[PDB]
Every structure is written in C-alpha cells, then in structure tokens.
Design a binder for this molecule. Structure first.
Ligand SMILES: Nc1ncnc2c1ncn2[C@@H]1O[C@H](COP(=O)(O)OP(=O)(O)O)[C@@H](O)[C@H]1O
Ligand SMILES: [Mg+2]
Ligand SMILES: [Zn+2]
Ligand SMILES: [Zn+2]
Lengths: 581, 629
DNA sequence: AAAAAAAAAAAAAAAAAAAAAAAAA
DNA sequence: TTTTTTTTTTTTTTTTTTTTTTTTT
C-alpha cells in the first residue's frame, strides 16, 4: 500500500526544486546548494527541515512523522543518488576515509551504501508537532519523529562506533563488508570472496580498522523540566544516543530540545527504548538595537531590569550585574570573576535575586543548604567515569549558593579553593584529580573575617522599618499580585532573552587599565586601606577595585577603562562597606 | 631485527615505500636546523647535519634508537610529514629501513643487538584528546599528561615454538597479523595434530599498561579531567614512574572489546588507547627531572662555565630568589626559603649508622591570613617543579593521600594505587589550607615528614612505600585573622609536634605600612596592564642537584652547635615556638641548601649563618619578645 | 562553638545457587 | 541430535570508605 520508489521520486523532487528568499530577497534553491556543498565534502550533515517539506507536501510530512527510519533511509539514498549530478569539481581528499573511498570506487557483492556516504541527514521536527513530555512518550510513539525537552543530566564521552566493518582476506585480496545495526555483531571468520569460494581456501580473513567505517557516538540521559513533572511524581529520565555531527553539542546541565526517533533496542519480546538524536537545540539560558546600548544610562537599565518585581535594592542589582559580566582574566594567573555575598535579615528578597540569576545567567547552578552538599558541589567517580557537581556544571558560570552560612563545613572549605584557586583538588580514596571550576560564586546567608576576607563584595541588607518606605514597597508588592507584572515605570524592563544577548555581547570586550589611572587607583586604594585601619582592607580590595572597574568598562564596551568606572566601582565598595555600618 | 608491537600506494593510501624511503634518507643526510641554539642541542656539531651526528652518537654508545623530531620533517618536507602522521604503520618501517641503510653504508662494521628503529616525536600536539575523532584513528599523535599508574610487565608472544608429541620435531612459527598459525600437521613424521605449542621455549616481548592523566591546555567549560590507557612495547616499559609528567607520542589505536571476556561477540562501540612510540620528559615551563640530571651529557661545557661564573657573583642567592614568581612582590625571605627548598639538602646514607633514613628535603609552612598571597606561591611551585602535587585540606583523606585498592576496570583485578603524597615522591607536595584538615589525615604527614616512608598494613598488602616528598604547606590563623592579641603558637593553631617537623614557618603578616601599600598597588596595577630567565635558573638547579654534594666543615659544625644552643635559649619562652633537637637538623639542611646555591661543595660559616638568619627572620623572632604577641 | 569519636549510609566486591543457551562431537 | 560447559541473573551477604551524627571541652 505504501510504495517507496514514488517516495524516492517525491523526496528527490523536493530536494532539487525547493527554494527560499532568506538572504535579502534572493531565491537560492535552499537544498540544491546544500547538496553541492555535500558533494564537495565541505559539509557532513544535511538537516531536512520538515517545515519546508510540509510547505508543499503535508501528506509526505505526515507519513514521515508517522514512520521515521524508513523515510530517513529514503532521504539518505535519494541524496546519494543526487550527489553525482551536483558535484562540480574534484575534492582535495579531506580525510583518509575519503582516500579509501576513492580507491575502492576506482578498483570497482556490492559496496554497502553506508560505507560510501560520508554525509549524514537529520529531520527538524515540524512546527505543527508540539514538543512532547518525556513521560508521555510511550509505545504508541515507537519509531515516530518526536521532539522532547529536558535537562541533560549526564552525557557519556565521544567514542567511535563502527557502522560498516571491513575485513581483508589473506588469500584473495578482496574486502568483506558488514553493516552494523545490532549493538553487537559476530565478526566474520571466513572470507566469502568469490575467488576463494571457487578456490575453496581457508578464507580466514582479518578485520581491518583502516577500511572500516567509524562514527562519533555519545550516550546521554535527559530529565524532565520541574515545570512538567506530575504533582506527586519525580522527573523522568530518557536515554539519547547522539552520533555523527550531533556529538559534543550538549554538556551536562544544558536545557535541550531534542528531535529524534523513539526506537527500541532488542533484548514476550520486551524491549528497552531510547531516542536516536537527529536535531539538538539548546534552549533558555543554554540558548546559543545599538542605539540603546550606546546610551549613558544603559548601565542603569540592565541593573533596573534585574528582577524588577524586587523593589529597591538599586545598588545591589548594579553589583550583581557586574558579577554576570565579570572582570577580565589576566595571565602575566589572576581570576576575573566577581564574588558577591548577599547577607541580610529574613525576608529581604535575598533568595529571589539568587533564583533570578539562575534563570538569567548562561551557565548557573542554584544549590540550597544541605540538600545538594558534598559531592553535589565537587565531583565524584561513577568503566569508572568522573561526574562533576554544581561547581563543575557551573564552571565558567554563576553558582548561586543560598544559605552559605549553614553549609557543611567541608563544602565551605571546598568553596574557599574555588573563589581563590578556581579549582577543586580532590585526593579521596577513589578520586585523585584537579577539576577546573572557574565559576563566580553568588552566596546568600544570614547573620566574619573567615568570610569577609574572601568575597570581593559583602553586601549587607537590613529591612529596617519605616512608615513611608514600607508603604511604597507594599504598593509595589500588592501590584505584582494584582497584575503579575512589576509596576510600570519610565522605562520598560529588558526581557531575559534580550538581556542574555547584551551581557554576552559585553563578555568578549577585554579592556585595559591605562597607566594614567594607576596613580588614581593607587591613591584610591591607600585611602581604603586606612579606613578599616582607623575604624578589613588588604591587597584583595585593590583587586576587587580592578575587577569591578573592568566590569563597568565592558558594560560601556570601551576597551580602555575610564576614571568614571573606578569611581563607580569604588562607589559600590562604599555602599557595600557602608551596609555593614 | 626486533619486531615492534607498537606498529604505487600499498592499499588505499598515498604512500609508496620507495618514495618515503628516499625522502627520509635525504632528510637525514642534508637537514640543518637554522634557528638551532647551541644550548638547545648539546654536544652536537651544529654546522654539520644533525641526525648524522645522532647516528654517530648511536655508534658510540650503542643505543639503537633515533629520536627524530617530527617538526624537523614538517619543516624539511610537509608531504612526508603528512604521510608519516596519516600512516604511522607503513611509514615507520620505511624510516627504519632508511636509517639502517644510512648507518650501515657509513660505519659498515658497527655492532648492534638489532636494527635501528626511528621514534617520531613532538608531533602536532593534540590539545585535548576529546577533540579527537574516529577520523583520527590509527594515526600518530602527541599528548601531554601525568602518569597515574603503571602496570607490571605483560609478556606477549612473537614466535611460537612447537614440538611434535611423537617425534619431537621443533619449528618456530612467527606472528602473522596478531595470530599464530598452528601447524596442525607435523612436518617431520607427518602425524596429524601432533604439534603442540611450547610456551617457555617460545619468544616473547614486553607490554606495559600505563594509566595516564592528561592535562589538556584546551579545557572547555564543565569538562572533567580525562584518563587514558597507553601501551609501552619492548623498550619503553618502566620508562615512566607514577607522578612523572610526560609527553607521549604514539599511535591512536581503537580495538574491539568482547561483550564478555569469554564470548567472541564484540560491542559495536570500540574503546581507544595509545601505543607509545616516544616519551619526552623535557619541559621548558618546569625544572629538570631526576632522570635528566642523572644522564651526564646535558650541560655543554660553555653552559657549565656560565653556571660556574654565575655562582661566583656575590648576589647569586638574591638573584636566584628574585627569579621565583616575578609577579609576587618583595617576598625576598619567602622566595629565599623556597629556593633553599628547591635545592634541598644533601642526601646521606645512614644504613651503616644503624639510624635509618634521614630526611634531606625541606618543609615550609606559610602561616598567614587569607588575604595575603599565600596560595599563589603554592600554586606557582606546584606549576614549577616536576613530580609536584597539590591538595586543599578538606578535599583529601588519609587513604587517598597514602594508598588505596581498586579493581582495575580493564583487567578486573584488585590492585593497589598510590596516593597524592606518594606521587610526589621526589618532588613537592603543596598542601593548601593546611589548618582546615582533620587530624586523621594530618597524622599521616608525621611519618612522611620525618622518616620519608609510609608503612601501610592493610588486608591487601603490608608494605612501606618510600615518599621523599617536601611539604609546602599553607595555613590560615585561627579566626582567619592574625589578631596581634594572641601569641604566635596560639595563633597558628597547630600541634607543637607537627610545627616541630617544619623547618621554616614563615609568618605572612600585613604591616600597616603606607609605602609598602603604595609599592604593592603599583606592582599589581602594572601586572594588570604589563630578571634571570627560566632557561638559566632551571639549568643552575639541575647542575647543583647533579654535582654539588656539600659536606660539613669544622667551623660550620661549631657555628651550628652554638646556633642550636642559642635557639634553645631563645625559644624557651612560653608563647614562642619552642626549639627542639629536630630544629638543629633543620639548620643543617638549610645550611647545606645554601651551600648548594653557591656550588661550594662544602658548608662553612657563611652558609650556617645564612641558615640561622633565615630561620630567625621566619617566626619574626626579632620582632617578637619574651612577652609573646 | 568547635573538635573527637562513633554510627550509619552507601557503594563496591565476593559467594553461590540455579536456570538457560552455545559449542562440540 | 544430544550432551556439556559455560553464561548469566538473580539474591544475598560482606567489607571498605566516606559521610553523617553524637558527645565532650
Ligand atoms: N524588596 C523586595 N521587593 C519585593 N519583594 C520582596 C522584597 N523583599 C522580600 N520580598 C518578598 O519576600 C518573599 C520571600 O523572600 P526571600 O527571598 O525568601 O527572602 P530572603 O531569602 O531574603 O529571606 C518573596 O516572595 C518576595 O516577593
Ligand atoms: Mg533566604
Ligand atoms: Zn579470500
Ligand atoms: Zn612428528
């Protein structure tokens, strides 16, 4: 009932005669160019966006989503047939396997198609297909093209999985080829070469890795978002087997939407399941005009846009903004991160800001008290692999630590290393490594030289009562509960999606401290030294000034720090210390 | 011709044997490195071809190896470099044939156990192995790492010696492609299946399995460290000990694994490992290892004379001290102490005395507030010396710092694995945040600091691992601040026994000085916008370790005795660190260390005076008083 | 409030008893 | 075809280490 030659014709027609005007009103035959690039070995993956197919053939897309592997194979074979008529020149033998392919073809019971592809194809789920929760992907969707969103909990390491095994006989000189579909395969012991068959020889052939075909392979477990777990249940995890050009795209803790095929691995005929990844996209914080950025007040606007529903705390948000931007690393090796600890009385929105940063920072982890302690922060050994904790997952990010004071004493000791060494030196029984945790710590605690001497900024928050100040806050909070949106102001706050781009745009702007400001900074530093002496300020404080000053320089996107940043950087120090007093 | 288990187009390639052979012979016969520096190549007549001189060295010593730098081929001929890297299996035999032909054309009467086999090295460094791809399979690669563990020798057959059960006719079959063709029929009496394999009469080569930790310079965010498996074949076995930092050049091998160790079925996924081709222990960012010092031919006569001249300058000690960590400002006494630690005292033999081993290393404890630049010195020394290790207090445990037992997940055998302290046997262990360390793991350090051994007695095995480590510990004052109201010993917050072990306790305090603050701010700001070179300090230390063996003199002995008596009188107060006999020994080491800086080869009054002065400056004895505080 | 000793958790290794499948003749 | 040795799997227990907790100064 369901022919496939007609399907091959349809897919070839689609590939040859589909076009778009993406590049400035230019019809360009979207997939023809991709085919040409494939034929020249300058592109290895051909993503067939099913939205394009549905634009002119809804029934074909319906069939594709209703049956995945068959149409994947059909598209692969169609691209294989189309490659010869689109090649325009001679490739430069990019890799060794291409040389082997060309030698096999020239020397030419057939070459398996998969042995001569050197090109992958993958479906991007049609927009009409709503992403499906992992828990609801069940037997009825086995073999279908489904898209599921989750959090990458643990991704294995890239390894070579053999697709086509190539053996060479010791007698005839012919090559034996074996496609691989089962996770394990029986190696061939005798050669079926027609010459030896005629000769009736031993035919003992030896596997050659030179001619065999290897593909990148990675296994990951992805969970469910906390927003979609049932009320009384725990998040469910599903396995994803990425391969080819879908490897090294997702790290642990990355929010990912993956469109693949829900296929079982044979073990009644009970069978496990997994997702054969086809398209991986990093979402939300993991996701991967100028007039306002050039504004003088653009610095204030980002600050005022950090958790707008949190009234007041104008200065604190401006300090956290710098933590997201971070200073600039110098390697004459001094870290460029900024550590801000919000200490205060209960119910002063410390946690909300800590939670907000998690939903904004690109890489972040929010660990609370002793819920995720010990190996939760550092790594552990789990062949035995090594799994990193919040710090490792938060490496080159922002680890939002809440209730830092009530943290396990060992965990506090581990953090001490991170905020100074930016590493985690473990010498446990089964573990002996030195992790890399270049993460900015954002600590929240309630009321310390053991802690003051470390954090660059120790902001102290006290909600001292006041008749009119409280009334304004009540109007602000009650407004939030009334409309679910922060009170309107002179400026509309920037969206998190927009903010991440802005902050990211400012990261790759390493500025420099001019010799001119050395006298100013040195003059400023010495005064800071005396105030604590007269009334703690050490060499750390000068570094805190430099890191903060550079952070402002990135916000203004000037490659040279100016005296205004130093004043603004110090002004934050003044308020931070004045908060203590 | 010792076979190497490490190892018109031949098949599906771009190499013809004759072309590679001739190209390699040419490269070997007419290659001169233009920017070659005489020191960089010691004992080599630069003007003449380098590798012909290498062959002359081989003729003299007899070592049948030719360390060929892959970069030399890269510069001389990039196509041959491509062929070598892409097809190490085919190219290396061609290079072996070429070098053998060259070395028997000349010197036709040389005698060697086997033919000469080339060892390409310094191939284009693979920053991170994870970035390796299946397209990079069976290709030469160079990585850099630290050797976690090395396994015992594994004998691998190369020739099977068969004998007939009936007539006892002996024939030797040779490994063909990883298999041995059992005759299955005797050639002498023609009886079927009468040929039985004989193990002990066969021929075997060696294979050593090394689990190595890589230090990839490309560290993507959230990437955990990576350990890999190396195989060393027939000469490279036990060329690297655990803790050694190496550059390993070898073939990236991927092999099948059977779903069980008994069934012939194999997982579709392979698992990769490197066959070692060359080890490079030299690094320009670190000092010379003990092995490099051991071999005599490392310092050119001109360089030796340069070091000798350096030793005669009065400011040799201060110049060397100023060289360590130039980014740290005016820590002259601390840098001098670290220099004396790097030089180390004389290694003496006390077996005849019936006394046991004597610690000749130096242990330095920096006690100071967290703000002060403590951890920077520890990390620098950890990133300076070879066989160095680092720890951060609560992040370690006693068993992990001494030894443990684990099932090797490639042979499934319970084997013993060393700890952090052992790995730095002949190096330095930088113990950061020493105060934040539970007493259980602290107790271990006593034996490692006095005896230099570690006697474990556990179900697995009872034995004592030798650990000659030097401990560089960093500690914070109790309450994280050196409040001047509490005495020195009270402020340090460590047991007196342990503090006695350390031979230098530097108190890093913050003097509220305006001039110092201004100068330090200038230094830091300059650093934020930015001598005696490494190549000279490294050579000086290597030479001093290699040759200088200071011996005490009469005046030095008398001065040491008087200094010890004065120390006992001075430290007899209540709050000051009490002086014990163990401190006298410390002085000796320090004195010897200073005597080693001057290349004196004999400790005299000046060395002991300097040791006493450095010890007194530590603990701020001059700035203290009987009313300690 | 902080350190020392004890207790419990938890993870890895070993025994082993029995049912089923692949290789051998 | 029929045996046999292995292969697994399925429970259970045991040992080391680490972590967590309790008691004392
Ligand atoms: N300045 C503020 N503006 C708006 N809401 C606030 C503010 N301070 C506290 N809140 C409210 O108090 C609630 C709890 O705050 P929380 O973050 O738990 O305080 P903390 O963590 O500092 O004890 C939050 O729902 C938040 O809306
Ligand atoms: Mg809170
Ligand atoms: Zn054949
Ligand atoms: Zn015989």
């Amino acid at each position: 009932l369901k022919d496939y030659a007609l399907e091959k014709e349809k897919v070839k027609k689609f590939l040859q005669e589909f076009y778009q005007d993406d590049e400035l009103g230019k019809k360009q035959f979207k997939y023809g160019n991709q085919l040409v690039r494939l034929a020249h070995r300058e592109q290895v993956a051909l993503y067939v966006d099913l939205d394009d197919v549905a634009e002119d053939d809804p029934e074909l897309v319906d069939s594709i989503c209703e049956n995945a592997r068959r149409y994947a194979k059909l598209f692969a074979d169609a691209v294989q047939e189309l490659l010869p008529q689109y090649k325009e020149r001679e490739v430069v033998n990019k890799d060794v396997l291409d040389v082997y392919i060309e030698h096999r073809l020239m020397m030419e019971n057939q070459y398996p198609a998969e042995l001569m592809r050197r090109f992958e194809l993958y479906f991007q789920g049609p927009s009409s297909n709503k992403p499906r929760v992992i828990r609801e992907v069940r037997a009825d969707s086995v073999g279908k093209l489904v898209t599921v969103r989750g959090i990458v909990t643990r991704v294995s390491e890239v390894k070579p999985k053999m697709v086509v095994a190539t053996y060479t006989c010791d007698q005839c000189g012919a090559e034996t080829y074996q496609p691989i579909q089962s996770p394990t395969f029986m190696p061939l012991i005798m050669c079926p070469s027609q010459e030896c068959q005629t000769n009736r020889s031993g035919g003992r052939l030896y596997l050659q890795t030179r001619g065999s075909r290897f593909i990148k392979f990675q296994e990951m477990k992805m969970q469910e978002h906390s927003d979609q777990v049932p009320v009384g249940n725990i998040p469910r995890s599903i396995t994803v087997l990425v391969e080819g050009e879908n490897t090294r795209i997702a790290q642990p803790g990355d929010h990912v939407s993956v469109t693949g095929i829900f296929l079982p691995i044979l073990r009644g005929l009970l069978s496990e399941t997994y997702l054969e990844a086809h398209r991986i996209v990093k979402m939300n914080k993991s996701e991967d005009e100028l007039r306002q950025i050039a504004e003088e007040d653009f610095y204030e606007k980002l600050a005022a846009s950090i958790a707008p529903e949190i009234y007041g705390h104008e200065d604190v948000k401006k300090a956290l903004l710098l933590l997201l931007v971070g200073g600039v690393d110098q390697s004459p090796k001094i870290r460029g991160n900024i550590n801000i600890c919000l200490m205060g009385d209960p119910g002063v929105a410390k946690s909300q800001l800590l939670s907000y940063i998690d939903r904004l920072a690109p890489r972040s982890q929010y660990t609370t008290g002793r819920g995720s302690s010990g190996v939760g922060l550092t790594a552990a050994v789990l062949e035995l692999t090594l799994e990193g904790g919040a710090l490792v997952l938060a490496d080159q990010g922002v680890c939002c630590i809440d209730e830092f004071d009530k943290m396990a004493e060992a965990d506090r000791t581990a953090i001490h290393e991170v905020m100074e060494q930016q590493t985690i030196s473990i010498a446990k029984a089964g573990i002996l490594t030195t992790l890399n945790a270049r993460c900015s710590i954002l600590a929240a605690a309630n009321p310390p030289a053991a802690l003051l001497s470390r954090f660059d900024l120790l902001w102290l928050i006290q909600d001292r009562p006041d008749r009119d100040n409280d009334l304004r806050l009540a109007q602000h909070i009650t407004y939030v509960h009334q409309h679910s949106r922060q009170p309107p102001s002179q400026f509309e706050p920037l969206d998190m999606k927009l903010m991440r781009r802005y902050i990211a745009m400012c990261r790759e702007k390493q500025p420099m401290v001019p010799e001119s400001l050395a006298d100013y900074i040195t003059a400023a530093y010495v005064e800071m030294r005396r105030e604590a002496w007269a009334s703690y300020t050490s060499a750390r404080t000068l570094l805190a000034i430099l890191r903060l000053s550079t952070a402002l320089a990135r916000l203004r996107m000037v490659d040279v720090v100016e005296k205004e940043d130093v004043n603004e950087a110090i002004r934050l120090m003044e308020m931070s210390k004045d908060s203590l007093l | 011709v010792r076979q190497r288990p490490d190892l018109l187009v031949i098949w599906g390639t771009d190499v013809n044997v004759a072309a590679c052979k001739e190209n390699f012979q040419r490269f070997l016969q007419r290659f001169i490195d233009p920017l070659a520096k005489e020191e960089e190549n010691v004992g080599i007549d630069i003007t003449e071809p380098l590798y012909m001189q290498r062959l002359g060295e081989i003729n003299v010593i007899g070592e049948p190896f030719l360390n060929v730098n892959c970069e030399h081929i890269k510069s001389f001929d990039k196509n041959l470099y491509r062929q070598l890297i892409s097809y190490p299996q085919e190219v290396i035999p061609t290079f072996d044939m070429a070098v053998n032909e060259i070395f028997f054309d000349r010197y036709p009467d040389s005698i060697l156990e086997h033919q000469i086999q080339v060892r390409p090295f310094n191939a284009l460094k693979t920053k991170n192995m994870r970035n390796l791809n299946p397209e990079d399979i069976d290709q030469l690669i160079t990585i850099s790492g630290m050797v976690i563990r090395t396994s015992q020798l594994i004998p691998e057959m190369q020739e099977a010696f068969f004998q007939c059960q009936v007539c006892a006719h002996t024939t030797r079959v040779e490994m063909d492609r990883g298999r041995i063709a059992e005759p299955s029929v005797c050639g002498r009496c023609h009886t079927t299946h009468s040929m039985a394999l004989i193990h002990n009469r066969s021929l075997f080569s060696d294979k050593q399995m090394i689990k190595l930790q890589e230090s990839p310079e490309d560290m993507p965010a959230g990437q955990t460290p990576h350990t890999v498996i190396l195989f060393a074949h027939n000469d490279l076995v036990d060329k690297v000990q655990p803790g050694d930092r190496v550059n390993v050049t070898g073939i990236y091998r991927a092999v099948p694994i059977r779903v069980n160790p008994r069934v012939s079925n194999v997982k579709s996924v392979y698992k990769t490992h490197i066959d070692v081709i060359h080890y490079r222990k030299t690094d320009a960012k670190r000092l010379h290892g003990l092995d490099e010092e051991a071999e005599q031919k490392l310092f050119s006569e001109k360089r030796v004379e340069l070091l000798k001249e350096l030793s005669r300058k009065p400011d040799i000690y201060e110049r060397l001290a100023s060289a360590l960590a130039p980014s740290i400002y005016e820590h002259e006494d601390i840098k001098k102490g670290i220099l004396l630690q790097l030089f180390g005292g004389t290694r003496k033999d006390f077996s005849h005395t019936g006394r046991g081993k004597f610690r000749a290393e130096i242990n330095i404890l920096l006690c100071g507030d967290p703000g002060t630049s403590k951890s920077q010195l520890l990390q620098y020394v950890y990133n300076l010396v070879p066989r160095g290790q680092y720890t951060s207090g609560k992040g370690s445990s006693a068993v992990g710092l001494t030894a443990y037992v684990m099932k090797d997940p490639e042979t499934r055998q319970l084997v013993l694995q060393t700890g952090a302290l052992v790995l730095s046997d002949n190096g330095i262990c930088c113990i950061d945040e020493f105060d934040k360390m539970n007493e259980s793991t602290r107790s271990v350090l006593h034996e490692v600091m006095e005896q230099q051994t570690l006697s474990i007695a556990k179900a697995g095995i009872i034995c004592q691992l030798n650990a000659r480590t030097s401990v560089l510990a960093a500690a914070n004052p109790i309450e994280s601040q050196w409040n001047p109201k509490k005495t020195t010993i009270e402020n340090i917050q460590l047991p007196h026994t342990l503090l006695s072990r350390f031979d230098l306790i530097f108190l890093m305090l913050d003097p509220q000085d305006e001039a110092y603050d201004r100068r330090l701010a200038h230094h830091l700001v300059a650093l934020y916008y930015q001598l005696l070179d490494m190549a000279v300090l490294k050579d000086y230390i290597a030479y001093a370790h290699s040759t200088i063996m200071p011996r005490l003199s009469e005046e030095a002995s008398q001065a040491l005795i008087e200094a010890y008596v004065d120390m006992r009188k001075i430290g007899s107060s209540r709050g000051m660190v009490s002086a014990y006999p163990r401190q006298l020994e410390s002085l000796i080491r320090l004195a010897e260390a200073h005597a080693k800086v001057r290349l004196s080869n004999k400790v005299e009054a000046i060395d002991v005076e300097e040791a006493k002065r450095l010890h007194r400056e530590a603990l701020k004895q001059s700035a203290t008083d009987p009313r300690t505080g």
